[PDB]
C-alpha cells in the first residue's frame, strides 16, 4: 500500500 | 467512466 502503480486514487481508467 | 483523474487502475495512492 503506498505510491506506484496498482488501484486506488490518481491518473488512468476508472471513475471520475 | 474512462481515462483521467479519480479512481480506477494507474498511477498515484493505493495498492499494487
Ligand atoms: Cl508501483
Ligand atoms: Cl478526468
Ligand atoms: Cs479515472
Ligand atoms: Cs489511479
Ligand atoms: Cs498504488
Ligand atoms: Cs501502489
Same mark, same amino acid.
Given at each position: 500500500?503506498? &505510491?506506484? &502503480?496498482?488501484?486506488?486514487?490518481?491518473?488512468? +481508467?476508472? +471513475?471520475?
Amino acid at each position: 500500500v503506498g &505510491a506506484x &502503480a496498482x488501484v486506488x486514487w490518481x491518473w488512468x +481508467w476508472x +471513475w471520475x
